[PDB]
Design a binder for this molecule. Structure first.
Ligand SMILES: C[C@@H]1CC[C@@]2(OC1)O[C@H]1[C@@H](O)[C@H]3[C@@H]4CC[C@H]5C[C@@H](O[C@@H]6O[C@H](CO)[C@H](O[C@@H]7O[C@H](CO)[C@@H](O)[C@H](O[C@@H]8OC[C@@H](O)[C@H](O)[C@H]8O)[C@H]7O[C@@H]7O[C@H](CO)[C@H](O)[C@H](O[C@@H]8O[C@H](CO)[C@@H](O)[C@H](O)[C@H]8O)[C@H]7O)[C@H](O)[C@H]6O)[C@H](O)C[C@]5(C)[C@H]4CC[C@]3(C)[C@H]1[C@@H]2C
Ligand SMILES: *[C@@H]1O[C@H](CO)[C@@H](O[C@@H]2O[C@H](CO)[C@@H](O[C@@H]3O[C@H](CO)[C@@H](O)[C@H](O)[C@@H]3O)[C@H](O)[C@H]2NC(C)=O)[C@H](O)[C@H]1NC(C)=O
Ligand SMILES: *[C@@H]1O[C@H](CO)[C@@H](O[C@@H]2O[C@H](CO)[C@@H](O)[C@H](O)[C@H]2NC(C)=O)[C@H](O)[C@H]1NC(C)=O
Ligand SMILES: *[C@@H]1O[C@H](CO)[C@@H](O[C@@H]2O[C@H](CO)[C@@H](O)[C@H](O)[C@H]2NC(C)=O)[C@H](O)[C@H]1NC(C)=O
Ligand SMILES: *[C@@H]1O[C@H](CO)[C@@H](O)[C@H](O)[C@H]1NC(C)=O
Lengths: 469, 449
């Protein structure tokens, strides 16, 4: 019962104490003003992060290359109309592109007989094509159609006089743009005359039409000087070449080649594919794809993969198999000629269940390519390591950061630590939790010291760490 | 008479919980699916609780806020414990959450896809809370209409959201709605995480503990059972789930939880200048929310000051404006501690667990009273099934949800139990006329004028 008298409180209240009350109020409002001023200062002196680069659709996600639809589907079901049934599987791969095969009319090196304005009835028809783009744009899968004067003969680009083979494709560009398809694939660049100016004109036409379209150019040259000469003016052009198809098989040489190509280009966008249109399996040893998938799926650019690569399908292993058009396999009934040769460790359903399979790895890094920003449009710097080891760090200005290590030799490898080659913003820590590995021997989410990397031969680690300010 | 009653209850129900909660409920809900289910289920359980509370309100009429019933039934021990838990960890930490989300939503304009520094957000939240404490104090004559203007800004913002979403769905906007595009599980469907997600919707549905004041202290409810619940619940859960639908139609699933803000990005992804008219309106709404919480907790302080407990030297008149000056300092200290140390969503889970434990204790006490009471008059119709359904549901919730993290629940129940020693040391041993007890009256002037 400490209820004081109101009259007692009033007679205790003095003008001096009123002055102290006014002083307390003034210093309280001064403290509020000081808090506001401190907030203003710390929000106006803050480091302003950069903005998104507003990349196009093809800059995000990988690409899928399909050579022959008959080989992709099989005998009897190889018609073009059956493509819509596989889009559910193709969207499960988290790939945001698709490349058709040559579906025009061309028998054998016949300029008068061939004509690029019509689709042969062997594959499908215009209504089936329109349904194909309708289902594709119903999904989030863009469609890219290629043009080539000869997809049968070994004179790939019509060695006769040039303007007659130029005008038809030239009108076919706007014909297929008004059809609805976006982008084109051009192969066998080396079989051309004035190819730089021709490609410049084609890119100019496509860019004058729209901006989301592209133009894929393919050559089998493997020379940096030849590549730079081909990209002498068309800097925005996306090109896949045979640059990485060298034997190599050591990390120092791979570092040298990748860094030389990147330095010669500058910092512009490019495409990372090992081959022109072939598979990774038939041009590489069979013990390296588990790390080559991570290498191709992380370098800055759009990785381009041939069809039937997510399972490591081979053409040389199976007898009676033409190397140009391998047959895609989905179950044990996909190869009725030689029963029993196929098994459950390479088919799609078999590899999908196993988390230590090639398809599982493809799905795991494909789920990381589309949804993450740092490896999407970040930077790329490497460490001056020792022996044949691959090392680089991918980062954005503020977002969480990635580090990838790889081994190419046949012996065990050490940590290969190197630092002080990066700005203070791009500083790496000593703790990082593992996210993925080629062969499952480590526990994901477990941090480790970065000086005790006992790397097994033919292995690669995907490291991860939150951003540190 | 139902119009003004509906006005005050929906003014108390809707807060700023429709902003922080959606991305948490999606992160813990596994996928786009079952989030609407959670937001509806929360409205259902809140409806059952509101029906039980309305039955208790139309029952025996003892005034004194919310702790009066639990003091009178089941002894005053549970009443003192509930009052202590209120004044410690349901009002101050909720005020902290409101002010901190005000700061977070204000700072996000200048950093669209960028993390702001924590010091700026904490300082802005402290400044906002001090401003609102001063606003609630001093000039009481216009504070009511100031809070009314804030709630008007709230209705304007929500109506604009309703408009853009509703006009948007017509443009074949079945994206991120249909199961073909609403059943992608980036995270495996877990039921413990489902309960953790349900906690955020529970926090969003806060304020239904506040309808008990004015429903009885108004025109008498002559067996007016249905109106006070069936004019509130279905409309608000429908508008909440439709606001979630509107949020989902203009955004991919990933962008909603891949940020610390649910709105503002909404304004930025479309329109363009309503993107600038919107965050200021959201700031107005959260301003009104903290003002209303301050008013209600000042009413708590007066009600507890009547009972003599929660030491009586608190919430007097100062000179002329009859403003509870000593209440607001004790208010601001417990939130300044949280501004010093704290985060957002762990505190959201803390608040949800604590207030649901409070209503569970109250409902269990009411059920034991109904078991123990064959007498007096109950003007409402008997129900006898929905309370026991709520009882088993809430028991299932607490028992199943204790697995989540012992760090929050353990400290919460520890300071729940910490009310017991001070309670018995005070009731049994304050009769001693100690020098501290004798001179406690002397600081009524040494603390304030
Ligand atoms: C009126 C009064 C005011 C004051 C008060 O009463 C009323 O208010 C009450 C109320 O407000 C309470 C708070 C409520 C909310 C609580 C949340 C709780 O978080 C839990 O913290 C656990 C600690 O391990 C786990 O969190 C992660 O657990 C993982 C596994 O162990 C760690 O791996 C990870 O740490 C990570 O390590 C690697 C780094 O790269 C990462 O950045 C970092 O995250 C932890 O995450 C966080 O890790 C931090 C560093 O290790 C802290 O441990 C932090 O919790 C800290 O806990 C302290 C303990 O008091 C607290 O003081 C401090 O501020 C908190 O930052 C914790 O989250 C768990 O999953 C998480 O849910 C926290 O632990 C205590 C907490 C905050 C409480 C502290 C006490 C209070 C204030 C009470 C206090 C009496
Ligand atoms: C890329 O593919 C080609 C074709 O398979 C590979 O062989 C090269 O083919 C070209 C065809 O023009 C050869 O050019 C030749 O030039 C002589 C010059 O007199 C001419 O008489 C011939 O008729 C022919 O046009 C070329 O010699 C041949 N070999 C090489 C090494 O280029 C080629 O190897 C593949 N790789 C590269 C990097 O080009
Ligand atoms: C990358 O290519 C450029 C051009 O060929 C070169 O870079 C410059 O090389 C000169 C020496 O010839 C140096 O003095 C400059 O500092 C280099 N500039 C940059 C930006 O690198 C060089 O061939 C390649 N760069 C490196 C580092 O090897
Ligand atoms: C994938 O499965 C096939 C199934 O036939 C494996 O083939 C085995 O090859 C060895 C080699 O001599 C034979 O001894 C076995 O009889 C074959 N069958 C089985 C069931 O083991 C093939 O080795 C498997 N691939 C890998 C990489 O292990
Ligand atoms: C294409 O070439 C024409 C030549 O007249 C030029 O005006 C135009 O700017 C070029 N397009 C682009 C995208 O540069």
């Amino acid at each position: 019962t400490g209820l004081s008298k109101e009259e007692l409180l009033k007679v205790a209240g003095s003008p001096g104490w009123v002055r102290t009350r006014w002083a307390l109020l003034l210093l309280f409002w001064l403290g509020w003003l000081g808090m506001l001023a401190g907030a203003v200062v710390i929000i106006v002196r803050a480091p302003r992060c950069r903005e998104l680069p507003a990349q196009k659709w093809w800059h995000t996600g990988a690409l899928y290359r399909i050579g022959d639809l008959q080989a992709f589907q099989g005998h009897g079901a190889g018609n073009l109309a059956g493509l819509k049934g596989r889009l559910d599987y193709l969207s499960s791969l988290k790939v945001k592109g698709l490349v058709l095969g040559p579906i025009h009319k061309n028998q054998k090196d016949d300029v008068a007989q061939t004509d690029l304005l019509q689709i042969d009835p062997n594959f499908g028809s215009k209504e089936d094509f329109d349904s194909l783009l309708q289902s594709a744009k119903k999904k989030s899968i863009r469609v890219i159609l290629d043009l080539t004067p000869n997809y049968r003969g070994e004179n790939s680009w019509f060695s006769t006089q040039v303007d007659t083979v130029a005008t038809k494709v030239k009108d076919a560009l706007e014909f297929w743009l008004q059809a609805g398809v976006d982008g084109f694939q051009v192969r066998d660049i080396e079989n051309l005359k004035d190819a730089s100016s021709f490609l410049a004109e084609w890119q100019n036409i496509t860019k004058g039409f729209s901006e989301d379209r592209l133009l894929i150019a393919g050559t089998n040259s493997s020379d940096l000087q030849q590549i730079l000469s081909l990209l002498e003016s068309n800097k925005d052009l996306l090109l896949t070449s045979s640059y990485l198809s060298d034997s190599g098989s050591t990390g120092e040489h791979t570092k040298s080649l990748v860094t030389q190509y990147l330095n010669a280009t500058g910092n512009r966008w490019c495409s990372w594919s090992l081959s022109q249109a072939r598979l990774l399996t038939s041009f590489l040893p069979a013990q390296l794809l588990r790390l080559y998938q991570l290498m191709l799926f992380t370098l800055p650019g759009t990785p381009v993969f041939s069809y039937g690569d997510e399972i490591g399908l081979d053409a040389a292993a199976l007898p009676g198999q033409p190397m140009e058009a391998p047959v895609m396999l989905w179950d044990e009934s996909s190869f009725p000629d030689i029963p029993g040769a196929v098994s459950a460790n390479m088919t799609v359903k078999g590899q999908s269940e196993d988390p230590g399979s090639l398809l599982s790895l493809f799905r795991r890094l494909s789920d990381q390519r589309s949804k993450e920003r740092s490896l999407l449009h970040g930077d790329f710097h490497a460490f001056s390591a020792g022996p044949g080891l691959f090392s680089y760090i991918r980062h954005w200005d503020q977002n969480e950061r990635f580090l990838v290590v790889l081994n190419f030799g046949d012996v065990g490898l050490s940590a290969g630590l190197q630092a002080s080659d990066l700005p203070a913003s791009a500083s790496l820590p000593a703790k990082a939790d593992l996210l993925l590995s080629t062969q499952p021997g480590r526990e994901e989410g477990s941090p480790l010291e970065l000086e005790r990397l006992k790397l097994e031969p033919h292995e690669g680690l995907l490291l991860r760490f939150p951003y540190a300010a | 008479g139902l119009l003004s009653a509906c006005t005050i209850i929906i003014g108390n129900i809707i807060g700023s919980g429709i902003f922080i909660s959606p991305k948490g409920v999606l992160e813990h809900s596994g996928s786009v699916g079952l989030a609407l289910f959670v937001w509806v289920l929360g409205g259902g359980v809140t409806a059952l609780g509101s029906l039980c509370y309305a039955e208790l309100g139309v029952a025996i009429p003892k005034s004194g806020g919310d702790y009066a019933y639990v003091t009178e039934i089941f002894g005053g021990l549970a009443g003192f414990l509930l009052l202590w838990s209120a004044v410690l960890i349901m009002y101050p930490t909720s005020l902290a959450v409101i002010s901190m989300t005000f700061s977070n939503y204000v700072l996000q304009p200048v950093f669209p896809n960028c993390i702001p520094p924590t010091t700026a957000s904490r300082v802005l939240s402290m400044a906002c809370l001090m401003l609102l404490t001063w606003v609630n104090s001093s000039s009481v004559r216009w504070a009511t209409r100031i809070q009314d203007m804030f709630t008007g800004g709230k209705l304007l913002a929500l109506s604009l959201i309703i408009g853009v979403g509703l006009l948007q769905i017509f443009q074949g906007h079945f994206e991120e709605l249909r199961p073909s595009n609403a059943f992608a599980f980036w995270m495996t469907p877990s039921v413990g995480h489902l309960a953790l997600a349900f906690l955020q919707g529970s926090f969003a549905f806060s304020g239904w503990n506040f309808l008990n004041y004015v429903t009885e202290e108004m025109v008498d409810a002559r067996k007016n059972l249905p109106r006070a619940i069936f004019i509130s619940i279905p409309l608000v859960t429908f508008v909440y789930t439709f606001t979630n639908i509107a949020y989902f139609t203009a955004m991919s699933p990933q962008e909603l939880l891949s940020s610390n803000a649910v709105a503002v990005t909404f304004g930025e992804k479309l329109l363009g200048y309503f993107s600038w008219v919107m965050p200021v309106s959201v700031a107005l709404s959260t301003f009104g929310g903290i003002n209303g919480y301050l008013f209600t907790y000042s009413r708590l302080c007066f009600s507890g000051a009547r009972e003599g407990h929660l030491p009586s030297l608190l919430a007097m008149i100062h000179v002329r404006h009859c403003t509870p000056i000593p209440a607001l300092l004790v208010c601001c200290g417990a939130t300044a501690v949280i501004m010093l140390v704290g985060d957002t969503y762990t505190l959201i889970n803390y608040v949800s667990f604590i207030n649901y434990l409070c209503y569970g204790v109250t409902i269990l006490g009411l059920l034991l009273l109904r078991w123990r009471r064959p007498a007096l008059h109950r003007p409402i119709k008997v129900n006898l099934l929905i309370p026991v359904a709520y009882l088993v549901f809430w028991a299932f919730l607490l028992v199943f949800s204790f697995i989540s993290e012992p760090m929050v629940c353990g400290v919460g129940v520890i300071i729940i139990l910490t009310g017991v020693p001070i309670f018995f040391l005070g009731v049994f041993w304050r009769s001693k006329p100690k020098c501290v007890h004798r001179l406690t009256e002397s600081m009524t002037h040494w603390g304030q004028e």
